[PDB]
Amino acid sequence: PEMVRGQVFDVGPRYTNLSYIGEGAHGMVCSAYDNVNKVRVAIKKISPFEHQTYCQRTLREIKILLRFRHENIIGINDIIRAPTIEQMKDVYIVQDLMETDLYKLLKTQHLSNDHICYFLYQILRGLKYIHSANVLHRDLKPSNLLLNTTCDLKICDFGLARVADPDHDHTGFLTEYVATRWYRAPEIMLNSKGYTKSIDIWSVGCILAEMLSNRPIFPGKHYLDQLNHILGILGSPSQEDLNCIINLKARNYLLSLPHKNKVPWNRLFPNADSKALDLLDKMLTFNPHKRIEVEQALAHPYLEQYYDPSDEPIAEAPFKFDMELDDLPKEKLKELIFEETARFQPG
């Protein structure tokens, strides 16, 4: 086995000339040369069986990544582990190398309107495929959007994904939520568990705002600050929107806030393409039932130079089941992960 600034990283014969890329807490990531395909690749090391939540989201992610096949979603080229479940300590995930991501790019680069259009298009083309599989990403954000040097875009990090379940969405006021605060739809904080497709659309809207200005549009510092950031720009909800909120705690909280006026988008983004602000508006709609869908966003005039429904594929095999992974002993998790990764074992 071989070293990379510390821990073991033995990725076996096939992958050589390692180079650290950063322990980004979803393992330790290194680049390497794939001697069968003769391209440099990316390798992510997982050690999940020492805590169960790490295991369930490793399992969910692998099953999703393996069933999905789409230009705008990162795939898995290979999975390296021990040949027996007794010996399986670490799991290595091999993917196409991607030189950067939109988070790193946004810190340093002004995006032209053409780049914003093209990035937005590829996010939605990939998200169309995801939703057609009845899957919600739930953690869309710039660092989860990888780019190569020709600005090809691929969605990654399905660790928080679930099968959609719009019928069992409702919950109380201020119920805890895992996904990154800045991209949470307003209804997460009010009445939603995030089991609805419109959760991802809000997130993409936030990414679009961030592409126009290089700064997060709603940088909430704590759970409830996130809601007050949204309301400060969108303004106080309408009575019609408030009447859709039946939980009294959520509704009376909104009712208690002083009246705020909308901030016009062309004030926030006086440089922006007006067609882009129109689609931003429909994406950042307070009411989840009025928020635009992924397919209508693709048909929006801002994307018409790219729109092509015959070149925007949908999944063959939808997940018709949420994976019943929460009530599983750690031994079942480990074995299901072993079994899911057998496809890459020699033999």
Curated annotation (Swiss-Prot):
Q: What is the effect of changing residue 44 to R?
A: Does not inhibit interaction with MAP2K1
Give the free-text PTM comment from the record: Phosphorylated upon KIT and FLT3 signaling. Dually phosphorylated on Thr-175 and Tyr-177, which activates the enzyme. Undergoes regulatory phosphorylation on additional residues such as Ser-236 and Ser-238 in the kinase insert domain (KID) These phosphorylations, which are probably mediated by more than one kinase, are important for binding of MAPK1/ERK2 to importin-7 (IPO7) and its nuclear translocation. In addition, autophosphorylation of Thr-180 was shown to affect the subcellular localization of MAPK1/ERK2 as well. Ligand-activated ALK induces tyrosine phosphorylation. ISGylated.
Q: What is this protein called?
A: Mitogen-activated protein kinase 1
Q: Which GO terms describe its biological process?
A: apoptotic process; B cell receptor signaling pathway; Bergmann glial cell differentiation; cardiac neural crest cell development involved in heart development; caveolin-mediated endocytosis; cell surface receptor signaling pathway; cellular response to amino acid starvation; cellular response to tumor necrosis factor
Effect annotated for changing residue 224 to A: Inhibits interaction with TPR
Q: What is its main location?
A: cytoplasm
Chain span(s) of sequence motif TXY: 175-177
Q: How is its activity regulated?
A: Phosphorylated by MAP2K1/MEK1 and MAP2K2/MEK2 on Thr-175 and Tyr-177 in response to external stimuli like insulin or NGF. Both phosphorylations are required for activity. This phosphorylation causes dramatic conformational changes, which enable full activation and interaction of MAPK1/ERK2 with its substrates. Phosphorylation on Ser-19 by SGK1 results in its activation by enhancing its interaction with MAP2K1/MEK1 and MAP2K2/MEK2. Dephosphorylated and inactivated by DUSP1, DUSP3, DUSP6 and DUSP9. Inactivated by pyrimidylpyrrole inhibitors.
* Subunit composition and interactions: Binds both upstream activators and downstream substrates in multimolecular complexes. This interaction inhibits its tyrosine-kinase activity. Interacts with ADAM15, ARHGEF2, ARRB2, DAPK1 (via death domain), HSF4, IER3, IPO7, NISCH, SGK1, and isoform 1 of NEK2. Interacts (via phosphorylated form) with TPR (via C-terminal region and phosphorylated form); the interaction requires dimerization of MAPK1/ERK2 and increases following EGF stimulation. Interacts with MAP2K1. Interacts with DUSP6.
Quote the function comment for this protein: Serine/threonine kinase which acts as an essential component of the MAP kinase signal transduction pathway. MAPK1/ERK2 and MAPK3/ERK1 are the 2 MAPKs which play an important role in the MAPK/ERK cascade. They participate also in a signaling cascade initiated by activated KIT and KITLG/SCF. Depending on the cellular context, the MAPK/ERK cascade mediates diverse biological functions such as cell growth, adhesion, survival and differentiation through the regulation of transcription, translation, cytoskeletal rearrangements.
Keywords recorded for this protein, A-Z: Acetylation, Apoptosis, ATP-binding, Cell cycle, Cell junction, Cytoplasm, Cytoskeleton, Disease variant, DNA-binding, Host-virus interaction, Kinase, Membrane, Nucleotide-binding, Nucleus, Phosphoprotein, Repressor, Serine/threonine-protein kinase, Transcription, Transcription regulation, Transferase, Ubl conjugation
Organism, scientific name: Homo sapiens
One GO CC term on file: focal adhesion
Provide the active-site residues from the annotation. 139 (proton acceptor)
Stretches assigned to the Protein kinase domain = 15-303
Q: What's the domain of life for this entry?
A: Eukaryota
> Outcome of mutating residue 177 to A, per the record?
Inhibits interaction with TPR
From the UniProt record, list the reaction(s) this protein catalyses: L-seryl-[protein] + ATP = O-phospho-L-seryl-[protein] + ADP + H(+); L-threonyl-[protein] + ATP = O-phospho-L-threonyl-[protein] + ADP + H(+)
Q: Which residues carry this modification: Phosphotyrosine?
A: 177
